[PDB]
Amino acid sequence: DDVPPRIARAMENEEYWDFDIFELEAATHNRPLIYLGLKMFARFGICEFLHCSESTLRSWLQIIEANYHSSNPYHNSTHSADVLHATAYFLSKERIKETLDPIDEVAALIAATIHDVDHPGRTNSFLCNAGSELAILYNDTAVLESHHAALAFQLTTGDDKCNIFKNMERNDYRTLRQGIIDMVLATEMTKHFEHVNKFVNSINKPLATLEENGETDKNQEVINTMLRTPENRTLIKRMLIKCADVSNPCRPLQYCIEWAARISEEYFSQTDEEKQQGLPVVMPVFDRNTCSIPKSQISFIDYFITDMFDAWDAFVDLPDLMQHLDNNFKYWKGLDEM
């Protein structure tokens, strides 16, 4: 409640897409998730739904954010705060409110908070090839993604003060647990095109068929009934967490460049270690001695981001994000200068 002024000023216009997350990072001293989490959870009313105190929520945000590695350029507390901001923005849209339930809103915001907890600044492929403790523990199968969700519940339910899922019905927690686990696992790279294609085939293509008929009152209930099913709601949640996780190319110009620099620097750390130890180089293009950052972002946007956000835009309607995506794509093209 009694928040200091710079951090209060940093979280002024938080409902808007244009948001200075790096000012909040600098203001909070690499503790943006606890301050942004408290406001976002209070605005939606998470602890009113979950039945918990503010002290229970603060201890949960404290222990979670502590396990985020500050030494990592990209995968740190500030990334999850940005993903939590992206998640809350999509939940606030007219399409998502009428489609999803309050249990899904809570599942999304909690998942966004924990989705990269205890990230070692290294990919799944690095851990499997190196033979890391988690690679052996999870059998080279969603090594990081399973560790993020597992460790999050270990820290939450393990301690009594940190447990936000204390005063809940066994059925409500069981449903909410499965919802969070699914969204955290859906962020995995290998399952990208599977989750994108299912969103197009099961939601967008049927919805395009029904919208061609008209705006009839009976037709809206057919659209509502179809989208609100347990299967399609899960596919929307899978798509929402995936877009929110990689929303940095659809941000304002100065924020887009900063996120690109961090994730690039993180891959160069991995590439130097792989060459030193004598491991198989999984990302040869991302080497500090050879990598064009502008050209790499153009490759990244064309392969993954363009088609994903196109489908997501068709469903939700996101004029700000696609306008930023166009401006940032043209900016990287301008930096060639040859």
The nearest distance, CB 248 to ligand GJR, in angstroms, is 5
32 binds, among Mg ion, Zn ion, ligand GJR, none (CB under 5 to 8 A by kind): none
Report the distance separating Cα 185 and Cα 194, nearest Å: 13
179 binds, among Zn ion, ligand GJR, Mg ion, none (CB under 5 to 8 A by kind): none
Q: Using N-to-C axis directions, what is the helix angle for 54-66 and 143-158, rounded to 10°?
A: 140
125 binding ligand GJR? (CB under 6 A): no
| Backbone torsion region of residue 143, taken as left when φ is above 0, otherwise alpha when ψ lies between -120 and 50, otherwise beta | alpha
Closer by beta carbon to ligand GJR, 178 or else 299: 299
Report the distance separating Cα 109 and Cα 330, nearest Å: 32
Report the distance separating Cα 4 and Cα 40, nearest Å: 17
Query: How many CA atoms are closer than 13 Å to the CA of 102, on its beta-carbon side?
Result: 10
189 binding ligand GJR? (CB under 6 A): yes
192 binding ligand GJR? (CB under 6 A): yes
Closer by beta carbon to Mg ion, 31 or else 115: 115
116 binding Zn ion? (CB under 5 A): yes
The kind and range of the H/E element at 330 are helix 319-334
Structure tokens at 227: 């989208």
Residue written as token pair 């979950």? 50
105 binding Zn ion? (CB under 5 A): no
> Quick one: which of 245, 250, 267, 329 contacts Zn ion (CB under 5 A)?
245
> Quick one: which of 34, 106, 263, 321 contacts ligand GJR (CB under 6 A)?
263
The nearest distance, CB 243 to ligand GJR, in angstroms, is 8
DSSP-assigned letters across all residues of 264-277:
HHHHHHHHHHHHHH
188 binding Zn ion? (CB under 5 A): no
DSSP letter for 237, please: H
312 binds, among Mg ion, Zn ion, ligand GJR, none (CB under 5 to 8 A by kind): none
Residue 51: strand, helix, or coil: coil
Identify the CA nearest to 266 among candidates 241, 286, 292: 286
Instruction: Based on DSSP, count helices (H) and strands (E) in the chain, helices before strands.
Output: 20, 0
* Residue 104, marked binder: no
Is 324 one of the catalytic residues? Answer: no
Report the distance separating Cα 242 and Cα 263, nearest Å: 17
Which amino acid is located at 54 in the chain? Answer: E
Contact letters for Mg ion, residues 246-275 (x by CB under 5 A): ------------------------------
Nearest residue to ligand GJR on Cβ basis: 304
Contact letters for Mg ion, residues 116-155 (x by CB under 5 A): x---------------------------------------
* Residue 307, marked binder: no
135 binds, among Zn ion, ligand GJR, Mg ion, none (CB under 5 to 8 A by kind): none
* Residue 217, marked binder: no
Which amino acid is located at 118 in the chain? Answer: D
Report the distance separating Cα 130 and Cα 277, nearest Å: 9
149 binding ligand GJR? (CB under 6 A): no
Single out the catalytic residue among 75, 119, 147, 324.
75
* Residue 245, marked binder: yes
The nearest distance, CB 156 to ligand GJR, in angstroms, is 25
Label residue 14 exposed, middle or buried (CB < 10 Å: 0-12, 13-18, 19+).
middle
Contact letters for ligand GJR, residues 233-252 (x by CB under 6 A): ---------x---x-xx---
Report the distance separating Cα 112 and Cα 110, nearest Å: 5
- Judged by CB under 6 A, which stretch of 59-67, 198-206, 258-266, 311-319 contacts ligand GJR? 258-266
Which residues contribute to the annotated binding site for a divalent metal cation?
79, 115-116, 245
What residues are annotated to the active site?
75
Residues that bind Mg ion in the complex, under the rule CB under 5 A = 116
